[PDB]
Amino acid sequence: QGIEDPDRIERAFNLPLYGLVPQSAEQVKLDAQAEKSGSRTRPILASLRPKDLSVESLRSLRTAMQFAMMDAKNRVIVLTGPTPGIGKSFLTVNLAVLLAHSGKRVLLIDADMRRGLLDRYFPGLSELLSDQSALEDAVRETPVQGLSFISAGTRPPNPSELLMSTRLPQYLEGLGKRYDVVLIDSPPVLAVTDATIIGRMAGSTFLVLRSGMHTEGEIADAIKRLRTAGVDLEGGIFNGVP
Amino acid sequence: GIEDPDRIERAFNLPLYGLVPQSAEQVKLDAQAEKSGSRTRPILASLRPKDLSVESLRSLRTAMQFAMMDAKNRVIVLTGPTPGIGKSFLTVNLAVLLAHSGKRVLLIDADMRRGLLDRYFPGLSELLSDQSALEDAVRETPVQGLSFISAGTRPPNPSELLMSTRLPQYLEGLGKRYDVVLIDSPPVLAVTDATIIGRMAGSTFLVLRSGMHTEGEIADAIKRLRTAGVDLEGGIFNGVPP
Ligand SMILES: Nc1ncnc2c1ncn2[C@@H]1O[C@H](COP(=O)(O)OP(=O)(O)O)[C@@H](O)[C@H]1O
Ligand SMILES: Nc1ncnc2c1ncn2[C@@H]1O[C@H](COP(=O)(O)OP(=O)(O)O)[C@@H](O)[C@H]1O
């Protein structure tokens, strides 16, 4: 039975929810006519519709996430989730733009090197972590003023092994000083190794969950992996509220 | 993760239909494919007929054939707990060896989020979104007696497409025109994935890679499948020490 009750989530797992993001009918429309026109560019709700209820809900979520990051003395924020299809791309990109709009210098990173498609909203991480590219080539300017971006890059055959290396942590330390926040869209926590990976990013970590998509045991499994790996799991983000 | 195959059959009453060694030649061929700016994956069963892994797969091929005719079903499904287990490698090599045994085989890449099987040679996504007819989606490969449906272009709604009425209707017809329909299904990450695999209505096998899975991760995958009503015949233990 898919979980839709946010109160049930907070009490069952001691997971404070940093935001309730409604299912945007305007986002569904934008998605529909981009998939109809054969668009290779996903729209950014935050840039196109500043008054949308999901966007106002995202503005709230952003301030709360900033405070959490500052309390934890971090410069990296990590979004994860139990599975794909939960709105982790939508959230990470809209959050990055709102942080950039607030006045912050933001670095967005697509760390899902098996299915990351954050480039669609605008070499990448796979090359940088393979030493096929230097940092100054991987870091790209975005249409959005103040937002810089590192795509997932060419799909590698060893994405897990690349994220387990010394290089990612060491790049993140420098990038955390050159940018106000480093926002990472990480791969979903399917297994122990996924949790270890997210631990190495060492940022304020938020578990994305979509309404009606997860069973109680499914949420429990993701939380237990993150928590047993020693990840800084600040709280959750509940997405697609009807 | 778990290395001992005896612990797997004992702990989950999951009889292993095959033990497939880590093939050193496959490792070499992947390295060689990687370094060369190549857009194709080498089929081991084609290139190395007496590779120990290919030899273990002919044993597996026969066991699955007995399974599917006892079940009076010409749909075979492979699933797994996560990516990186060798499900692509096993399905394509099992498809080729079944063709070599003199069967008309249809291989379907149902994993529409990654869709890699076409690298070994319109697809499923265009078929289930009514953009293509079955006639245009089914392709004849360079392997004689082997036909193939690719993943197709990555859709925004993969689970929605696999949960549509079209999938089982198409499989009903294709099962009458081929001796074997072999499906590379998405991994069983949640009950929704187990339902989709249940609608495929085939003799189903759980792929597990040596040293990758905890006892809990294996248990979750099996539980999702058994509770969704899936005909889980047994498992395939891949990457064992040669
Ligand atoms: N709150 C929402 N309102 C409307 N559409 C949404 C919402 N959240 C996600 N979506 C849509 O659902 C789909 C899946 O979201 P996405 O971020 O791509 O998933 P993933 O978690 O795999 O990154 C996309 O088409 C996205 O635009
Ligand atoms: N038994 C094996 N011996 C050697 N290499 C293997 C074996 N099984 C899989 N591989 C390799 O491991 C990688 C991952 O396997 P693949 O089938 O692509 O994973 P997935 O489960 O995500 O489909 C590939 O490069 C594949 O060729």
Author numbering:
A (entry chain B): 476 to 597, 603 to 722
B (entry chain A): 477 to 597, 603 to 723
From the paper:
BceF is a bacterial tyrosine kinase (BY-kinase) from Burkholderia cepacia, a Gram-negative bacterium accountable for respiratory infections in immunocompromised and cystic fibrosis patients. BceF is involved in the production of exopolysaccharides secreted to the biofilm matrix and promotes resistant and aggressive infections. Similar to other BY-kinases in Gram-negative bacteria, BceF is composed of a short cytoplasmic N-terminus, followed by a transmembrane helix, a periplasmic/extracellular domain, a second transmembrane helix, and a cytoplasmic C-terminal catalytic domain.
The crystal structure of B. cepacia BceF kinase domain, overexpressed and purified from E. coli, was determined at 1.85Å resolution. The plasmid construct used encompassed the BceF kinase domain, i.e., residues 471–741. In the crystallographic asymmetric unit, there are two virtually identical kinase domains of BceF, with a root-mean-square deviation (RMSD) of 0.36 Å across 241 paired residues. The active site pocket in BceF, with side chains closer than 4 Å to the ADP molecule, includes the highly conserved Pro497, Ser499, Gln502, Ile561, Lys563, Ser564, Phe565, Arg590, and Asn719 residues, along with the moderate evolutionary conserved Gln498, Pro559, Arg690, and the evolutionary variable Asp506 and Arg517 residues. Of note, Arg590 is facing the active site only in one of the BceF molecules in the asymmetric unit (chain A), but not in the other. In contrast, the interface of the dimer observed in the crystal packing of the BceF kinase domain was not evolutionary conserved.
